[PDB]
Amino acid sequence: EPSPYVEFDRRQWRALRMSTPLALTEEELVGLRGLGEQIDLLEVEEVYLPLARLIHLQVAARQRLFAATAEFLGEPQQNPDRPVPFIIGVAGSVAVGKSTTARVLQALLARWDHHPRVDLVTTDGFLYPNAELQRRNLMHRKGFPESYNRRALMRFVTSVKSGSDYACAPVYSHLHYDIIPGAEQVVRHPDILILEGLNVLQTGPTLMVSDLFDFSLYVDARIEDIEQWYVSRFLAMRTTAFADPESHFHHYAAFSDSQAVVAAREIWRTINRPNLVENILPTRPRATLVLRKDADHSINRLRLRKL
């Protein structure tokens, strides 16, 4: 029986790297690396370089596609110094490490001949404010589709891709657990915009941000390991983030491995776990590429959508 997907294991995938140049320092990789992640330059070579190569084979191609419609509409040929922005979506659960994947991926595409203007945006700033969430009773549902201003989010990506000179996005504070007043992230006609989020790949009764993606990644892993990674790093933050007297969750810092584990499992169970199962996982089937990680965070298997 035929399939739209083709699957590899690093052995295979790492080959397609061809001769793609590794433009990343190990100290540079570390500044993109997040607490918990095991990513090293090897993986960046055997996994991110082929991805980088792949993506570039399509940025030019996906171009000959807007051209076609331009040529159809009887329109000039926009400045090759400003074509249509390439949209990439990175999706996956909390703690799966999609955020590092996105940061790394940006660093790569960024330092790639030309001088590509690769921008990265997380759907975080598109969360309604704690006060707005309280009004809607969603304070315990952050991460769920309805806790985001998907209306605003669409205008953003739509704007950018439709060739605008600048689009603004709100900013979220993880320390203060809320959207920052006045904060603005301005994105000016990138060449490639990477949108990172949980349900970014979701679909609905209306054109959504995923309908604008030209390529998408879905970092994956057994729901059982993610919980581990989630909990494990809840504890780990007792001495990093929660340590700041300014943190909203500074109270978690004094917890014990035990108390913390209870706390962590409960949040996972009541929030992130459900959200992953009923919202994020059902989008996995339509991601250009899935990055399957082993319990050790190692990406040892991939799934590409050929169709």
Ligand X SMILES: CCCCCCCCCNC(=O)CCNC(=O)[C@@H](O)C(C)(C)CO
- Record the tokens describing residue 125, joined without a space: 């700033």
Q: Any known ligand binding at 98?
A: yes
Comparing CB distances to its own copies, the nearer of 127 and 201 is 201
Number of residues forming the site for ligand X (CB under 6 A)? 12
Residue 259: CB atoms within 10 A of its CB come to 13
Comparing CB distances to its own copies, the nearer of 30 and 168 is 168
Inter-CA distances, 290 with 104, 123, 280, 301, Å: 16, 20, 13, 8
Q: Where does this chain touch ligand X (CB under 6 A) — which range of 80-88, 184-192, 266-274, 293-301?
A: 266-274
In the set 11, 27, 31, 69, which binds its own copies (CB under 8 A)? Answer: 69
Q: Any known ligand binding at 94?
A: yes
In the set 5, 8, 66, 249, which binds ligand X (CB under 6 A)? Answer: 249
**Residue 16 near residue 48 (C-beta atoms within 8 A):** no
Inter-CA distances, 139 with 136, 153, 177, Å: 8, 19, 11
Nearest approach, Cβ of residue 102 and ligand X (Å)? 13
155 binds its own copies (CB under 8 A): yes
Comparing CB distances to ligand X, the nearer of 51 and 95 is 95
Of these partners, its own copies, ligand X, none, which one is at the site of residue 53 (CB under 5 to 8 Å by kind)? its own copies
- Record the tokens describing residue 59, joined without a space: 């940025």
Q: Where does this chain touch ligand X (CB under 6 A) — which range of 14-22, 179-187, 230-238, 296-304?
A: 230-238
Q: Which residues bind to ligand X, rule: CB under 6 A?
A: 94-95, 124, 142-143, 230, 233-234, 249, 267, 271-272
